[PDB]
């Protein structure tokens, strides 16, 4: 190419958007924004493919252009605006609030939350620097910078934002015994307790996580998001509790849902 690309073919779109083959050649191609385009939901896919409020992209244009969608407390008229992990999508007209949280199969769930919960979110601090007359700074996982954080906040911690002010209320430290969600790789969407972290210098660290049923899995350090302190999550968790069932017991649950219902 002679410059940056603007299209996305539909087959090369991310798998967890769950687009299908035959409706078009192109995928929505997210705008640049706070989240990575392999790691986001564009607002057009959330609003007609997940919520079924629209049937075309033209109707998503009509819904968004009435200024009806607030993502993290601000109105977005962009239909390909990249919403991402733990963003609060709040539709005021229908009185719904949503948070984007991965399912146990690594896709964003349609997780409804109460408007008490819709005033905060958790972020993961990715960078700390001191800049220009000794003012300390944060950089979170969704491109927020915060001036003057608490000096105990370090890289890989998890802070809590109030969505109106933008300021930190409190935070969790990165330690063994805290609760996780995996935000990357094979183990994506799983939830458990930190038990170990082995440090390889010059390369990626590996964190071992233990499930609520005693299953254990590793990730890398960058695929780790500290949800809660100890065992209590600071947010509401989706339908499955981050416990990935095997295919045999998922089949057993799906068959037990048919011999009882009907």
């Amino acid at each position: 190419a002679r410059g940056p690309k603007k299209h996305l073919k539909r087959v090369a779109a991310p798998k967890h958007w769950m687009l299908d083959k035959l409706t078009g050649v192109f995928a929505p191609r997210p705008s640049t924004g706070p989240h990575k385009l392999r790691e986001c939901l564009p607002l057009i896919i959330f609003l007609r493919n997940r919520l079924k409020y629209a049937l075309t992209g033209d109707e998503v244009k009509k819904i968004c252009m009435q200024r009806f969608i607030k993502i993290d407390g601000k109105v977005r008229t962009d239909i390909t605006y990249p919403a991402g992990f733990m963003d609060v999508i709040s539709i005021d007209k229908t009185g719904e609030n949503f948070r984007l949280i991965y399912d146990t199969k690594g896709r964003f769930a349609v997780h409804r939350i109460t408007p008490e919960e819709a005033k905060y979110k958790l972020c993961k601090v990715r960078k700390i620097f001191v800049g220009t007359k000794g003012i300390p700074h944060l950089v979170t996982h969704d491109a927020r910078t915060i001036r003057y954080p608490d000096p105990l906040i370090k890289v890989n911690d998890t802070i809590q934002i109030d969505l109106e002010t933008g300021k930190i209320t409190d935070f969790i430290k990165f330690d063994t015994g805290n609760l996780c969600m995996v935000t990357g790789g094979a183990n994506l969407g799983r939830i458990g307790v930190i038990t170990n972290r082995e440090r390889h210098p010059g390369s990626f660290d590996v964190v071992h996580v233990k499930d609520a049923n005693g299953n254990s899995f590793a990730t890398r350090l960058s695929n780790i998001f500290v949800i809660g302190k100890g065992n209590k999550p600071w947010i509401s968790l989706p339908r499955g509790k981050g416990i990935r069932l095997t295919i045999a017991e998922e089949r057993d649950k799906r068959l037990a849902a048919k011999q009882s219902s009907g």
Binding site: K9, R10, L22, V25, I247, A248
Partner: protein, 180 residues
Amino acid sequence: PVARSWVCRKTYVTPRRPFEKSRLDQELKLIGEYGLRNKREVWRVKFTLAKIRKAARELLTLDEKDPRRLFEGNALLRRLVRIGVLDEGKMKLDYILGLKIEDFLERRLQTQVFKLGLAKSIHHARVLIRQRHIRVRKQVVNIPSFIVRLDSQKHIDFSLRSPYGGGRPGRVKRKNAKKG
């Protein structure tokens, strides 16, 4: 770049020996017992069993407690039991190797129409299906190679918009009534 899909697949395989007596005789017997159109209809059913047996030949080589053998070995048995080719009590993975062509050819809709007393030969049944006289629970089926499942078997009838069922009489009876 078009928004199409080019996935397709052949349903039959031609035999390696083109003129082999005692293959021709056996396949002609299988045609005559079931009223098939040509030899490709026989080779189509040889192809599905050869894939089912290849799928069970590889599960039988894995460890007896392996998760793939326990998971895909139980889905493969469930489908054969469901379409009536296996028995319920025969749900071990080794009885798949004791399945035959005629066990699948019994479960065509054409033979079920003949065997349920709706027709009076295996050739009256195909010609009954093809001109829209047979339904399965609500739905008129045109297809003679419709593999009937074991629960959708007693719901086979005469398709209420047909002269043999609900009965507006046909084009020929109507004209003969108009004539005299």
